[PDB]
Amino acid sequence: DGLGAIKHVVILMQENRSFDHYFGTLRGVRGFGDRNAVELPSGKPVFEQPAALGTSVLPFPVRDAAETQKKDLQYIGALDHSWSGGGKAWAGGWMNGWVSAKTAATMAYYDRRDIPLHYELADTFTVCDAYHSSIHTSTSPNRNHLWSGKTGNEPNGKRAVGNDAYNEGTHPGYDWGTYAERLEKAGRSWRTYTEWENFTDNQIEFFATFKAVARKALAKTGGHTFMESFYAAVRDADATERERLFGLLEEGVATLDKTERSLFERALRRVETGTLADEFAKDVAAGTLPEVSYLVPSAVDSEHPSVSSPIHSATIVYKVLDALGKHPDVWRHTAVFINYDENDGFFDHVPPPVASPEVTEEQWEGKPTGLGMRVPMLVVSPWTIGGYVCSEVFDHTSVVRFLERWTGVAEPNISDWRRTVTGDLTSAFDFSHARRRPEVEQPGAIPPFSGRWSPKPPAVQHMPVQEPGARPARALPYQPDAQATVEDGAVRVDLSNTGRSSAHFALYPYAGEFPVPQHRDVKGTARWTVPVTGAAYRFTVTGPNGFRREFAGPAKDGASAGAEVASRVDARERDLHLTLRNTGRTTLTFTVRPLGYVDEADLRDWTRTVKVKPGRSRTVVHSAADAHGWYDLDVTVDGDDAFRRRLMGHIENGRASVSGHHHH
Amino acid sequence: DGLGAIKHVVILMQENRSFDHYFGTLRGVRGFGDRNAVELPSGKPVFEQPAALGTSVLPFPVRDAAETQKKDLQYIGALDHSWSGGGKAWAGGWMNGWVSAKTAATMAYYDRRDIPLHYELADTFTVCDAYHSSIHTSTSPNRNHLWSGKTGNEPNGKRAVGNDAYNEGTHPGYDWGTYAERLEKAGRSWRTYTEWENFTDNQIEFFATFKAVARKALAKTGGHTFMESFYAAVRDADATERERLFGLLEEGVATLDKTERSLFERALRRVETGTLADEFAKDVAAGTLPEVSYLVPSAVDSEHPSVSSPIHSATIVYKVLDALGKHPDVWRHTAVFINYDENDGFFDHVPPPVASPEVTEEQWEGKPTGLGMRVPMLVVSPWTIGGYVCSEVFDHTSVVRFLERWTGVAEPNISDWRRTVTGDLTSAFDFSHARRRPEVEQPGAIPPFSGRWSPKPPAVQHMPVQEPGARPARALPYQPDAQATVEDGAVRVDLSNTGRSSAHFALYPYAGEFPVPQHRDVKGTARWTVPVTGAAYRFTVTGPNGFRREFAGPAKDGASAGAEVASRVDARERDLHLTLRNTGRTTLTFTVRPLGYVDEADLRDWTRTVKVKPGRSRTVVHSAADAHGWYDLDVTVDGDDAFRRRLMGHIENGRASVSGH
Numbered sequence A: 001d002g003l004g005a006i007k008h009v010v011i012l013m014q015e016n017r018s019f020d021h022y023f024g025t026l027r028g029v030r031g032f033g034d035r036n037a038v039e040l041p042s043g044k045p046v047f048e049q050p051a052a053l054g055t056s057v058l059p060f061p062v063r064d065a066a067e068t069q070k071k072d073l074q075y076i077g078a079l080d081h082s083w084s085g086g087g088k089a090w091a092g093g094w095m096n097g098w099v100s101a102k103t104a105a106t107m108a109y110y111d112r113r114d115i116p117l118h119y120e121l122a123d124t125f126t127v128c129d130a131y132h133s134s135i136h137t138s139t140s141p142n143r144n145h146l147w148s149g150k151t152g153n154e155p156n157g158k159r160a161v162g163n164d165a166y167n168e169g170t171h172p173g174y175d176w177g178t179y180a181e182r183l184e185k186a187g188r189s190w191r192t193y194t195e196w197e198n199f200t201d202n203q204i205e206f207f208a209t210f211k212a213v214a215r216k217a218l219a220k221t222g223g224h225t226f227m228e229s230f231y232a233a234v235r236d237a238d239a240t241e242r243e244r245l246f247g248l249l250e251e252g253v254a255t256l257d258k259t260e261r262s263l264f265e266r267a268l269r270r271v272e273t274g275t276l277a278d279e280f281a282k283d284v285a286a287g288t289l290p291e292v293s294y295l296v297p298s299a300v301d302s303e304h305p306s307v308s309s310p311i312h313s314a315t316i317v318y319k320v321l322d323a324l325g326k327h328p329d330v331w332r333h334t335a336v337f338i339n340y341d342e343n344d345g346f347f348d349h350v351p352p353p354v355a356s357p358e359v360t361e362e363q364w365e366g367k368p369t370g371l372g373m374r375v376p377m378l379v380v381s382p383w384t385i386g387g388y389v390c391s392e393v394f395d396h397t398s399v400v401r402f403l404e405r406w407t408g409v410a411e412p413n414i415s416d417w418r419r420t421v422t423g424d425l426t427s428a429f430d431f432s433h434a435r436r437r438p439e440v441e442q443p444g445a446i447p448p449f450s451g452r453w454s455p456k457p458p459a460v461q462h463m464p465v466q467e468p469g470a471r472p473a474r475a476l477p478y479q480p481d482a483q484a485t486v487e488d489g490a491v492r493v494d495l496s497n498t499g500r501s502s503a504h505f506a507l508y509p510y511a512g513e514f515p516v517p518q519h520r521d522v523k524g525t526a527r528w529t530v531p532v533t534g535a536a537y538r539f540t541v542t543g544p545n546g547f548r549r550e551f552a553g554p555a556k557d558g559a560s561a562g563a564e565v566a567s568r569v570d571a572r573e574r575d576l577h578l579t580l581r582n583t584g585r586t587t588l589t590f591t592v593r594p595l596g597y598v599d600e601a602d603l604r605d606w607t608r609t610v611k612v613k614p615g616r617s618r619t620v621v622h623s624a625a626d627a628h629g630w631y632d633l634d635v636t637v638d639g640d641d642a643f644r645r646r647l648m649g650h651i652e653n654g655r656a657s658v659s660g661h662h663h664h
Numbered sequence B: 001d002g003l004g005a006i007k008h009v010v011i012l013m014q015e016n017r018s019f020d021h022y023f024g025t026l027r028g029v030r031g032f033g034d035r036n037a038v039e040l041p042s043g044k045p046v047f048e049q050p051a052a053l054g055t056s057v058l059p060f061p062v063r064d065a066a067e068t069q070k071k072d073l074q075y076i077g078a079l080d081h082s083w084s085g086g087g088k089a090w091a092g093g094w095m096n097g098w099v100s101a102k103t104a105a106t107m108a109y110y111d112r113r114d115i116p117l118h119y120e121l122a123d124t125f126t127v128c129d130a131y132h133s134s135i136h137t138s139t140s141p142n143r144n145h146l147w148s149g150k151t152g153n154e155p156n157g158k159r160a161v162g163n164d165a166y167n168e169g170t171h172p173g174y175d176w177g178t179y180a181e182r183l184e185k186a187g188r189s190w191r192t193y194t195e196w197e198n199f200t201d202n203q204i205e206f207f208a209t210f211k212a213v214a215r216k217a218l219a220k221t222g223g224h225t226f227m228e229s230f231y232a233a234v235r236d237a238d239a240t241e242r243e244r245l246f247g248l249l250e251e252g253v254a255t256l257d258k259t260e261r262s263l264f265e266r267a268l269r270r271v272e273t274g275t276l277a278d279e280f281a282k283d284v285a286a287g288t289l290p291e292v293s294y295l296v297p298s299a300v301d302s303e304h305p306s307v308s309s310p311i312h313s314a315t316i317v318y319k320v321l322d323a324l325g326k327h328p329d330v331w332r333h334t335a336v337f338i339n340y341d342e343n344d345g346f347f348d349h350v351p352p353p354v355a356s357p358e359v360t361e362e363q364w365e366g367k368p369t370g371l372g373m374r375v376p377m378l379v380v381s382p383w384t385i386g387g388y389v390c391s392e393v394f395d396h397t398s399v400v401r402f403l404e405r406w407t408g409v410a411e412p413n414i415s416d417w418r419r420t421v422t423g424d425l426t427s428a429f430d431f432s433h434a435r436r437r438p439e440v441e442q443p444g445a446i447p448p449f450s451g452r453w454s455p456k457p458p459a460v461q462h463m464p465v466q467e468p469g470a471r472p473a474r475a476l477p478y479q480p481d482a483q484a485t486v487e488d489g490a491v492r493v494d495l496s497n498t499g500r501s502s503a504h505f506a507l508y509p510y511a512g513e514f515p516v517p518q519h520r521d522v523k524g525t526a527r528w529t530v531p532v533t534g535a536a537y538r539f540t541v542t543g544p545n546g547f548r549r550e551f552a553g554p555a556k557d558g559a560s561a562g563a564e565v566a567s568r569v570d571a572r573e574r575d576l577h578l579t580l581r582n583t584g585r586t587t588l589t590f591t592v593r594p595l596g597y598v599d600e601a602d603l604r605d606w607t608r609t610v611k612v613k614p615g616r617s618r619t620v621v622h623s624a625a626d627a628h629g630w631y632d633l634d635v636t637v638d639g640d641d642a643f644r645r646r647l648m649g650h651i652e653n654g655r656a657s658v659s660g661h
């Protein structure tokens, strides 16, 4: 598994940016050109968000709005990022409440001219475009997953879905335990790198073991009971009062027992402001970088839109990666994960994989606590060079799962559902070939601050154009399929997935089959019974990595109900075997037409018309090998516009491939 | 001119090794024993590189570090090789930021016990010890120079001093010409020999013309737009997938017109992994070797320290030269240039000739873009046999200039400064006397890979010893001299060079005269004005091939104010005429003492003590003819501790000579 090449993992979680907000226009990721986008109940594509008075907001660039409103694109402000606001944007799974819940600024986005370091990093290393924040809400519950594998309950017994822990004087801290405490018990080295100001982002500080450590360490300081209280005083003190404060701290630190002292040194001692990267660089140069490093930048360095900016973040990212590259022998054995805690209130078009209501562990007030919106995740390391995309579903607990595989130290906090639906991040890596280490360009000057502002859409709206082209793609642990069978009052949808990992299916009803979209996780086989209440059915099933099955047609013994399409994927050949069946009394004529991945001067050789008589079946084999596994097929019956079957997907063979963007 | 005997030029450029890193111990080249080594501001020699807090790091052998750290000497890793890291190491021209910029591993070197084939080729053919990489940075800007004569600008208008072009799915490619496109239009034949994996070293692929041909030829491959994208899928594919992939490729290749098709075949079609020398040998055997061959090995064969090794490189170099030797008809009309793209971050002690700030075409962000660190260059041919050293200043564009002089196809991309300061590599050859193909030892077995590692300097440091002896040396197109006259508040330095090529002079200040070293290119005469603000001055001027002039003395009113030295070189006698004059009011006794090139038993007969009364002058004639034109003289005045004039160099006479050891 080649994980023995890793000696250091460095985790750098920035704040409050959604995937499309930054990378919707990036070549070769699931972005503004996504051909697996879901259609809203209004029939419009998810990108066309309902606004007030029957209007719509499309994604629009921050740069133009900044010019229009005469403001700086670096300093847009924050939007609602609350548990309730998220449920409103999410709208029961229909993903059409974004403008109402978040304002129209939710659709604003940056592109490569705006954030060139961000784009160059994705082009050089590996970017994850199915990486979700852990829960659709604010910072603290998301950071809980990264540090401990879950967000549990508040002391009042309610689910921890807000920032209540930030009242550090009155909150007693969370009691379900952190991963770093297990690393400590197992003898593995770790350290938090964090400055005097750290924007309540060092989540370990809110856990009960560490509150007890801080209180004892601070006992002599005149009343401070948690570190942020003490460091607020340090930040405001003159030189003389700082020396006094730090001398009183060190007297308290000397009273800690061996375990408390170690936890204090690794989680709670902050470095002077401005020196996070220099402190990290010093450990790199000394050969003392630990096995696991948490980098927790200050507010202004955090990328959070209320206190920071993209260029502030790019600046600290550069200094961290530069500090690493200054010592090649540490660089050759270090993986760096760069992600975001949540999406703020910024729109993203991918409906997240959610826990269905039967998964009570991951429901709160009738809403899923499981996988929020996509955020950018970049994996920077000697083993991820190449500009690859990795489309395996991950969340913040996937970082903990990486550490489980690497160190052997388990995190029992991760829920069974979450562990089933997310991966362990090992698929982003390729341990087999060395390359030269890329040089990363240093960011430009930080513009002078000229106030926060909120972008408003242009008067003339335009769909953004994603940078054209495909991207090399990592192999995925999925092999999904779905077939329909119309059966007396309902359609029986047979879901299958022969991959080594469970795959998430979502069903979107467009003929009143259900009131909201249905979600299911499948390893092996599973069955949806979709009740057809009228004369027709029309719904769409999505899955990972562009997988799509569309279903339309007539109901009981009513019209052309004889038509049956079955399918089987063959991984070794990357062939789709379509069994076309006639369950009726008339001699149907099927047509199979490519909708994509076939050069237009060529479709007729790949379009197939086949005649099937009553009680019989013909098999047509579609080869996707020329398209490296990608297929997009339309199956219809002549003289009938009710019946349709669309089949889109990528057949996996265990080897790297390309993304789906060479559709046209 | 003898260039008529050449029918084939073969260019094999390996990766990321500095000259001293490989040949600092080689007999008879400018290496670790270099008597013209520059002194650092600390007063230490350049080999003693400052580390932390008044400590330093001498060159140290990889082989010993490998015993200490229990690693394999073949598999040391790469160091920093960026434009800004190079600037820090070069340190404005003072050459004392190496350890800070690159880590102490920058001083690690190999010798004959470790890399015997490299040394044997130097002993057998011709080695160039003033061959520099074109620019002090990474691979791509240097390979730009070999393939195109320059590194121009990125699309954003910044100077292309980095590897931006390797982001091939986004970067649009470079817009100035390649030299190969000029050979093409001129009807000359050329071919690049490269495998499915070529480590982003086939520089022609990053020029817009070839990005366009690649995109067109890949149009039916289902998503690929640059060749490396397609071949990555080929390398991962089984035999059945491979046949489909090559079928998809050939469908697009069939759509190329006559000219695009020739470009594709000559620059873009890669051969199977492991068969580079085989496909080269096939062309040699069939009589179809082109006029110009670019050999671009795979990553594992490139010698690059992050993917390869010296023995991996020695293995492929030997196979290439063996293919040529197997066909004497082809060998006898073939010149092979073996060089390196850059020095990685490995130390080399020779400060490069750099463009001065006046030469704004070779400046970017206040740093010179012009001549990086020395790298090994070996010239293997019927006309370079005999173990010669050539010390004429060259860079990667000097290979292009050789092609100019041979094909008549000019490369206008080469800047005027580069044409002035570097030669055309004909000086490395002796076309009058072809000699028989010598045999060279085949490299041994490649050790199993045991991991990259970083050599650390030993606890007890030792300056390395260069192999003893001198080598035959090519005649050089320089004849430099420099002399000084003390004036009120300044020392005036008259530079001269009577050779047919411009000679590069550098001035190193050790008394505050300037904040950094100064650099001048001189054909004819030129003059420096060295400000003297204090009681004394001390500075050194270097020039090509061991040329040195040290000047030190009091500013005014000391025991030697009127001490003045002039010099005149005569090439026909290889004589140095020293004129010693007294422009003061006290009588002076000069001593002229050889510091080298005189038999220790004979030192006294060649030491001159001469009295020079005020307002008069006397002439000493130093005969360098028995030292093959080499001289190293110390001129002092009895009773003055400050005053010194050192004169060292080699008098050229148009004939092959010997090196300075």
Ligand SMILES: [Ca+2]
Residues within 6 Å of the ligand: A015, A016, A138, A139, A341, A342
């Ligand atoms: Ca946040």
Ligand SMILES: [Ca+2]
Residues within 6 Å of the ligand: B015, B016, B138, B139, B140, B341, B342
């Ligand atoms: Ca290189």
